[PDB]
Amino acid sequence: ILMAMDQIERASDKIAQGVIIAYRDMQLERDEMYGYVNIARNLDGFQQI
Amino acid sequence: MDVLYSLSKTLKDARDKIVEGTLYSNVSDLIQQFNQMIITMNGNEFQTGGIGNLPIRNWNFNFGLLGTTLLNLDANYVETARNTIDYFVDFVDNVCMDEMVRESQRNGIAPQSDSLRKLSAIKFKRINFDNSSEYIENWNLQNRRQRTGFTFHKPNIFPYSASFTLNRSQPAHDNLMGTMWLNAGSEIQVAGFDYSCAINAPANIQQFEHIVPLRRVLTTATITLLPDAERFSFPRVINSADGATTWFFNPVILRPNNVEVEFLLNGQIINTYQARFGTIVARNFDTIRLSFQLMRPPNMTPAVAVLFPNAQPFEHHATVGLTLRIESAVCESVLADASETLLANVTSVRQEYAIPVGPVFPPGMNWTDLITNYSPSREDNLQRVFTVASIRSMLIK
Amino acid sequence: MDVLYSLSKTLKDARDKIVEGTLYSNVSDLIQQFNQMIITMNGNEFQTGGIGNLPIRNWNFNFGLLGTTLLNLDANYVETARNTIDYFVDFVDNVCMDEMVRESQRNGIAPQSDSLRKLSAIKFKRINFDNSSEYIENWNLQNRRQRTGFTFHKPNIFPYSASFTLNRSQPAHDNLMGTMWLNAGSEIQVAGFDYSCAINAPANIQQFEHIVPLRRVLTTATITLLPDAERFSFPRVINSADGATTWFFNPVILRPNNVEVEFLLNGQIINTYQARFGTIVARNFDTIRLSFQLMRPPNMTPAVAVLFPNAQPFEHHATVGLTLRIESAVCESVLADASETLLANVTSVRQEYAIPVGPVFPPGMNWTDLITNYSPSREDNLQRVFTVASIRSMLIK
Amino acid sequence: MDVLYSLSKTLKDARDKIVEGTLYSNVSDLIQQFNQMIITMNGNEFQTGGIGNLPIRNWNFNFGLLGTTLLNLDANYVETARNTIDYFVDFVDNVCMDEMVRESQRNGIAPQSDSLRKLSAIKFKRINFDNSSEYIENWNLQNRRQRTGFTFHKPNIFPYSASFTLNRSQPAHDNLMGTMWLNAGSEIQVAGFDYSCAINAPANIQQFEHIVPLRRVLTTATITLLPDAERFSFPRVINSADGATTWFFNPVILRPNNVEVEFLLNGQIINTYQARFGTIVARNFDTIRLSFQLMRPPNMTPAVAVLFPNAQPFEHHATVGLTLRIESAVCESVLADASETLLANVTSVRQEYAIPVGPVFPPGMNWTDLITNYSPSREDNLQRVFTVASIRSMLIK
Amino acid sequence: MDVLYSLSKTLKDARDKIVEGTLYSNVSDLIQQFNQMIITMNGNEFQTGGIGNLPIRNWNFNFGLLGTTLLNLDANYVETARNTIDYFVDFVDNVCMDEMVRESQRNGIAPQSDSLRKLSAIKFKRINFDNSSEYIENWNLQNRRQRTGFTFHKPNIFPYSASFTLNRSQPAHDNLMGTMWLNAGSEIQVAGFDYSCAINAPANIQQFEHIVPLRRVLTTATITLLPDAERFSFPRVINSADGATTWFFNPVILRPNNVEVEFLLNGQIINTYQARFGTIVARNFDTIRLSFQLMRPPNMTPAVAVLFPNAQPFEHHATVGLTLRIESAVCESVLADASETLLANVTSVRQEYAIPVGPVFPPGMNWTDLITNYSPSREDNLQRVFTVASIRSMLIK
C-alpha cells in the first residue's frame, strides 16, 4: 500500500500536487483527456518549498 | 551513455514506424514514449563545440506534444513528427561528434563533453527505451564489473612488424640460415630459410622456432592453416640492419614435415595441434608458437641432384612457408576489424574538423602505433568512442 | 513498393510469433494487423507473370478473419493461420518474381509490373506496418531526397581490368620499363617494372605513377596497405600489344621506397600518407593515385652485382610491388556487395525464365560491363531491383 | 526444443529492457511473459550433468511473482529482476552445456539430455515466446518439411586435398605434363603444366581438365574468377606419387585462353561461362568442372627463344592456373562458416570437458574429415548442436 | 567505497569516545549513528575470503540497540558497546584484507571482492557518516572529477637508474669526458667528469648538461640544491659501457660555475635559477634539466701546477658535482613516500597470505619496477589499494 501511494494520490481528480511559477512565457501541453491543459509533468529546475 | 542510446533508438523508431495509414494501436507505446521524451527534454539548454574547429551551436528545447487522439494517422501528423525529429537527430549527431573529439587520460568510462555530462544526472534517466544493441549491452555489462564479449570477422589484432632474424650469418652474405616472417593484418606468414639444406646440421634436420605474442585475450577462434606461404616464394633483395649491407634470397619451397603449433596463454599450454592442416580451432589462447622441421630429401633425381650441391657454392636456397589466418574469433575488448565501419567513422569525424592531436591517441589515429603500445586506459577510451560511434551509425545511413 | 515489404515483414512475424503456448497479449498488434490486411486484400483480384517462362497465375483472396483465446492458443487456430500464411507467401514470391524481370530506360523509381502498380493505389495504403530494415529505409529516405547510403564489406566495385603501360619500349623487347597493374574485384595490385635498374635514369631512382578512377564516391573507408606484390612476382611470358609476339618477364622484388598513397576529390588533395602501411582510414574520396620510386641499392654484394651491371644485357629484372585492398566502406549509391546474396538472387530470377538482354542490363547480368557504364538511370533501376530482391529474400530462405 | 530458445530470448529481453526509468507501457507483455514462465516453472526438480568431466548440477525453482503496479521502474524492481535473472542465466547456461556435448546415432533430431526431455512435455509448452533468430526458424521450417535455407560467407565447403596427377611422365621425372590443384576452404586453384609446350600434341593446344565434386547442394553463389594461380608458380621440390623420389619444378606462368567454366546439377549442364574473368554468378550447382587451354605462341622475341627450345633439354615449363573463390553462398544443409563462430563454439565446449566419443562425430570435430564422409545422421546431429550453440550465444558471450 | 570509510570512522569514534563516566552530551550523534547502523545492518549475511590463504568466513549481523538514557555511562554500557565494537572491528578488518588482495586489468577503481560489491547496494547507503581523511576526500572528489591533491613528506618519484654516458671514448679507457649520475629516490646526484682538464677544449669551458624526465607532474615543489656531490667523489672501478673490461676513475672536486637549474613543463621554461644554492621553489614542473660548466683554473700554485700536465698522460682527473633533493611535494596522483606506510601494509598482507601474482602488479609489489612503466590502470589500482589501506590503518594500529 505504500509502494503504490503516489499513483493512488495523484490520480485523484480533486486535489493537485502543487503550483509552479516562472514569470516567463511558456507553452501549454496537449493531452487526449483534457484538451489544452496547463500541466508540468516534472518539477526540475526550480526551488522546492 | 545509455541514455543517448535510448534517445537514438526512440528517434529511429519515430523516424521509421510513423507512416501514413498504419493503425494507431500499433504505435501507442511508441507515441507515449515519444511524448515522455519530449516532456523530459523540454525546457533545458545545451551547448556544443568550442575546441578545435567544431562549429559552436546552441540548442533550446521549446516544443509541443503529439496528439493521442486520431484513429488513423494522417499527413500533418507525419510532418509535425518529422519537424521534431530533424531537430532531435541533429542534436544527437552533434552531441556524438562533440563527444568523439575529446579524451581524458584517466577515467575514460565517464562522460567528457558537456552534453553527456549533463545527461548523466538522475533527472534524465527517465528515457531507457531498451538496450538491444550489442555494443550498448557490452557497455552496460562493463558498467557493472561483469564479463563482456564481442564477435568479429577477421579482426586485425596482430601488431604490424616487418623484420627478419638470422641464426647463421656471414659478412659476405652467401651462407645464411634464419627465419623470415611478416605479421600484417589478421594473417601470419612465417618462413624459415637455410642455404645448405641441412648438410652440416645434426641429423640432416634443421629445427625452426617462431614466437608472436598478443596484447589481449582472444577466445573461441577459428584458424585456417595452410602450408607454403605466398609472400616468401619468389626472389628478394633485402637490406639489413647494418645500414650498408644488401643480400639476395633465392627461395625454393621444400615440403614441410612435422608441423607443430602451440597456443599458449599466461605461459601455459592450452591447445596443441600436430601434423594437421585445413581449418583448426582453439578455445582460449594468448600467444602463438610455431615449430617445424626443414628436412633434406634422402632420395633425389638428377634434376634435384643439381639443385642441392654438396659444397659451399650454392645456386638455389631452400625454405618452407606457413600461412595462418584468423577467420572468426571472439574477444573481450573492442577491436577494429575489416567487417565494420566504427574506427573508420571515428577517424573520418576527427579529420573532418581537423582536431589537433590529443595527449593519448597517437596522431592521425594510426592503428599500428595504437596497437604497438596498447594500454587498458586506451582500451577504455576506445570502447567509449566506439560505442558513441555505433550510436552515430544508427542515424545517418 | 512499401506494401510488398509490409507484407513480407508481417508474414515473417506471423509465421515466427504465433506458436502454441504464448500469451494472448503477445500477438495483439500482429492479430489486428493481420485482420486489417485480410479486410483490405479480400476481393481485389490480381494477376502475376505474363512475360517469359514465368507461369501466368491468378489470385483471389478468400480468407476469413482470425480468432482469439484468452489464456493460450490452440493448434487449430495455428493451422488456420498457417494456411493463409502459405497462400500469402506464395503470392508474395510470385509478385516479387514478376517485379524482378521488368525494366526500362524511363524513370525506374515508379513501379513497372502491373501487380505492384495496382497494389500501390491509395485504396491499399492502410496496410503499412513498419519500415525497420536497411534497404526499405534507404528507399524511403531517397524518396525525400536526403543523405542515403549502404553498408558494404569487401565491396566488389572496381571492374576487371588487366592492362599495362610502357615508358620506354624497343622493337626487340629487351629493355622494357613501365608500370603493370591488375585491379580485380576489391584488390588493387600495381607493379612498376624496370630492366635497366635505373643505371641510366637521373638520381638512380625511377618514378612510377599510377591512377585509377572510381565511378561512385566512397565515405569512411578503411584500406589495408602492404608494401609488396604477392601476385605479380612470377616469371611470365606476357603477350605484347602487337597481338602476335610475346616478351619475357622475370621479376625480383625490392622493398619499395617513398610509397605515397593519395586520396583526391575532383582533383583536390584530401588525404596523404607517407611511409605508412597497415589499416588506414580515408575520410572521403573518388579517385586513387599511387606514386612510388624504385631505387638502385647503394651497395651491391656479389649476389646483387651479378644481376645489375653497367652492361646492356639483363636477365633478372627488378620490380617493386604495392598492394591495395578495401575492407569496408559506405557508398551513397547502391553497389554489388559480397556480404549479401542480393546479386545472386537477382541473376537467378533473371536467368530462370530465359529473359533476354534488356535495354539496360548487359547480357547474363555480368557485373563488369554494367559497372563500367554506370548511369543515374541505371543506378535507380539497380536500387529498385535490389530492394525488390531484399524483400523477396525474407520469405523463401 | 524451442522452449530453450524462448528462455534465452526472454532472459535477453529482460536484461536489456528492464532498466530503471522506462515507461511501464513498453515492457508490459514481456513482464507478463516472465511472470507466467515463473508460475509455470515452479516446483520442478532437474538433474544436469553426469557425463565425462562435466560436473553434476541440481536445480530447484521457488520464487514469488514480480511487481506490476509501478509506473516508473525503480531500484528495487530492477534489483529483484536482476537477482532472479542471474539464477535463470546460470540455469540456461548449464542446461545448454550439458545437453550440447551429448550425441547419438539414432534420432539425432530429438532431445538428447534429461533437461530437454523433461522440458519438452505438454505442461512446459506454455512458455514459448518467439522465433526471431535465423537458425531456430530454419529448425522450425525443416521440422515440418519446408524448404531449408542458410546464408554463409566464404564457408568451408570444399574439403582439404592436396593431390595431383600427371598425364605424361618419365621414370626419372624430367619431362612431365600434368595437373596440380590445391582445394582447401572455399578456394580452388587448379594449375596445368606442360614441359614441352605442346610440341608433340596436335594443333599446338594442350587441354587440362579437372572436376571438383561438392559434398552438398548450394544455391545463389557468387564466384570471383582471377585468371592466374597464386600458388603453383614458385619453384618447388615436390615428392612424386610413388613416394620414392622427388622432382624439381621451375614453372613460368602464361595466361590461359579459351577458359571454360561450367556448373552442373544432377549430372547435367546448367550454366556455361566462357572467357569471362572477374565476377560470375550461378543459381544452383553441385559439381564444378573446369576446362582450359594452353597454346604455344606463334611468334617470339629474342627473350623468348631461350624459354621453349624444341631440343631435348627442358628446365622451364609453360604453366597456367585459374583461381576460383566463393564470396557468398546459400545452402540447404548446415556447414561451418567464416562469418560466425558456430564450429568454434562447439569445438571449444567439447574440448573443455573432453567427452568420450563413439562412432557419432569425427574425432575432435575435425572439419576436413567431417566433410570427407557426410552421412545424414551426422548432418542432423551437427544441425542440432549448431542450433544449441546459437541459443547459447544469445546469453553468455 | 565511502561506506567502508564511514564504518571505519564510526567504529574508531565508538571505541575511542565511549569510556566509562563520560557525559551523554558528547556522544549523542555517535549513539544515533550506532543505533542506525545496527538497525540497518541486522539480518543480512556476508561471505569473504576463499582466495589463497583466507578461509571462507561467514558473518551475521545481529545485535541489540543502545539505550537513550543513563545520562552518565556506566561500565555495563561500556562492555555492551565493546562486544559489538570488537565484532565490527573483526568484520571490517577481514573484509579489508580480503579486498586488498584482488586486482583487475580494467576498471580498477571499482571494487572486486564480493563483500564491497554487495556493500555498494542501495539500502546500505543510510550509513555514510562523514569524510575527513585525505584519501577518502580525494576519492570522493575524484568521483566528481575535480582537482586532486596529496601532500607528501620526501616522496620517492625518481626511478632507479645507475646509468652513465661518455661523450668522448676510446677502447683504451684513459681519455674520457662525460657525466655520471644517480637517480635514487628523492636524491639526484649528477656529476660531470673530464680527463683532459679542458686544455684542448675552446675557451677552457667544458659544457655539461643532463635531463631526467619525471613520470608524473608535481606542483609546489621545494627543492634543496647543493653544489657538491658526495657519491662520484672517490676512486672507483667501473665496468665499461658495453662491458668488456674495467676502467679507472680518480676524481677531484672543483667549484661549479654558472649553475643553471630549470623546471620545465611540456617544453616551457617556467622557473629559472642562476648561480643560486640553498632552497628553490618550482610552482609546477614535470622535467628537470641541469647545466654546469667545468672551468680550467686560470691561475695555479705549484701543487695544482704539477696536478695537470699539459700532455696526454693524465694521473688525475677533474669532475664537478651537483646535489638535488625533493624536500616536499604535492602531486595530482597517488604515490609511495617515506612518511606514510600504506604501501608497507599492502605488502604486509600480500606476503602474509601469499596471493598469486596478477599481470597488473610486478612481483612483491616492488616500487622500482612499478614506477618503471607507470600506467593509468596501475595508477587506479594503487589509488584504490592505498585508500583501503588508509581505511584499515584507522582501526588496527
User: How near does any CA of chain A get to the CA of D23, in Å?
Assistant: 14
Q: Could you tell me the resolution of this structure in angstroms? A: 4.7
Q: Do B64 and A30 touch (CB under 8 A)?
A: yes
**A41 contacts on B by Cβ (under 8 Å):** 39-40
D-contacting residues of C 174-193, CB under 8 Å? 174, 184-185
What b-and-e string marks burial along D254-268, b requiring 16 or more CB atoms within 10 Å of the CB? bbbeebebbbbbeee
For residue C340, the number of C-alpha atoms closer than 13 Å in the C-beta half-sphere is: 21
**A4 contacts on D by Cβ (under 8 Å):** 69-70
For D237, the closest of B147, B252, B328 (CB atoms) is B252
Interface probe for B, chosen from D17, D20, D23, D25 (most Cβ of B below 10 Å), is D23
The C-alpha atoms of residue D113 and residue D99 are separated, in whole angstroms, by: 5
Question: How many other CB atoms are there within 10 angstroms of residue D249's CB atom?
Answer: 22
The end-to-end CA distance of chain E, in Å, is 21
Q: Would an 8 Å CB–CB cutoff place B348 in contact with chain C?
A: yes
Q: Do B126 and D26 touch (CB under 8 A)?
A: no
User: How near does any CA of chain E get to the CA of B377, in Å?
Assistant: 6
Chain B nearest-CA residue for E121: B144
What angle in degrees, to the nearest 10, is found between the helix axes of B376-393 and B2-17?
20
Q: Would an 8 Å CB–CB cutoff place B36 in contact with chain E?
A: no
For residue E299, count CB atoms less than 10 angstroms from its CB and return exposed for 0-12, middle for 13-18, buried for 19 or more. exposed
A-contacting residues of B 87-146, CB under 8 Å? 123
Interface probe for A, chosen from B45, B65, B71 (most Cβ of A below 10 Å), is B65
> What residues contact residue D68 under an 8 Å CB cut-off, 6+ apart?
D31, D35
Nearest to D350 by CA among D105, D91, D51: D51
Give the three-state DSSP class for B145. Answer: coil
CB D98 within 8 A of CB D115: yes
CB B338 within 8 A of CB C222: yes
Chain C nearest-CA residue for B348: C283
Interface probe for B, chosen from D9, D13, D17, D22 (most Cβ of B below 10 Å), is D22
Q: Is B266 marked within a binding site?
A: yes
Q: Do D71 and A7 touch (CB under 8 A)?
A: yes
Question: How many other CB atoms are there within 10 angstroms of residue C144's CB atom?
Answer: 8
CA geometry: angle E237, E239, E240, nearest 5 deg: 125
Nearest to C181 by CA among C61, C2, C323: C323
User: To which H or E segment does residue D215 belong?
Assistant: strand D205-226
Q: Do B107 and E145 touch (CB under 8 A)?
A: yes
The C-alpha atoms of residue D220 and residue D151 are separated, in whole angstroms, by: 10
The C-alpha atoms of residue E146 and residue B117 are separated, in whole angstroms, by: 13
Instruction: Report the Cα C115 to chain-centroid distance in Å.
Output: 28
Q: Do D347 and B127 touch (CB under 8 A)?
A: no
Q: Cell for D247?
A: 622432382
What stretches of chain D show up as alpha helix (H) in DSSP?
A: 2-17, 28-40, 75-101, 114-118, 134-143, 342-353, 367-372, 376-395
Q: Is C194 marked within a binding site?
A: no
> What residues contact residue E384 under an 8 Å CB cut-off, 6+ apart?
E1, E108, E109, E111
Q: Output the DSSP codes for D246-287.
A: EEEE-EEEE--EEEEEEEESSSSEEEEEES--EEEEEEEEEE
> What residues contact residue B366 under an 8 Å CB cut-off, 6+ apart?
C276, C278, C280
Q: Is C266 marked within a binding site?
A: yes
Chain B nearest-CA residue for A30: B65
Interface probe for C, chosen from B12, B23, B174, B349 (most Cβ of C below 10 Å), is B23
Q: Do B145 and E376 touch (CB under 8 A)?
A: no
For B279, the closest of D15, D156, D234 (CB atoms) is D156
B-contacting residues of D 59-78, CB under 8 Å? 72
CB C326 within 8 A of CB C154: yes
Nearest to B286 by CA among B157, B156, B98, B131: B157
Q: Output the DSSP codes for D87-149.
A: HHHHHHHHHHHHHHH---SS-TTS--SHHHHHTTSSGGGTT-----SHHHHHHHHHHTT----
Q: Cell for C161?
A: 581490368
> What residues contact residue D2 under an 8 Å CB cut-off, 6+ apart?
C19, D128, D131, D136, D139, D140
Residue with the three cell numbers 595437373: D179
**E120 contacts on D by Cβ (under 8 Å):** none
**B137 contacts on D by Cβ (under 8 Å):** 15-16
What angle in degrees, to the nearest 10, is found between the helix axes of E376-393 and E2-17?
20
3-state SS of B372-394 is CCCCHHHHHHHHHHHHHHHHHHC
Chain E nearest-CA residue for D78: E122
Q: How distant, in Å, are the alpha carbons of C315, C317, D306 from that of C248?
A: 9, 10, 10
CB E90 within 8 A of CB B363: no
Q: Do A3 and D67 touch (CB under 8 A)?
A: yes
Q: Would an 8 Å CB–CB cutoff place D21 in contact with chain B?
A: yes
CB C4 within 8 A of CB C390: no
The C-alpha atoms of residue E224 and residue E210 are separated, in whole angstroms, by: 18
Backbone angles phi and psi of C306, in degrees to 5: -65, -25
Give the three-state DSSP class for C14. Answer: helix
The C-alpha atoms of residue E82 and residue E77 are separated, in whole angstroms, by: 8
Q: Do D279 and C368 touch (CB under 8 A)?
A: yes
The C-alpha atoms of residue B291 and residue B306 are separated, in whole angstroms, by: 29
CB D297 within 8 A of CB C246: yes
User: How near does any CA of chain A get to the CA of B397, in Å?
Assistant: 33
Residue with the three cell numbers 574477444: B331
Q: How distant, in Å, are the alpha carbons of B14, B153, E176, E239, E240 from that of E170?
A: 79, 57, 8, 14, 11
Q: How distant, in Å, are the alpha carbons of B256, B291, B292, D348 from that of B274?
A: 12, 10, 10, 18
Q: Would an 8 Å CB–CB cutoff place D67 in contact with chain A?
A: yes
CA geometry: angle D86, D88, D93, nearest 5 deg: 95
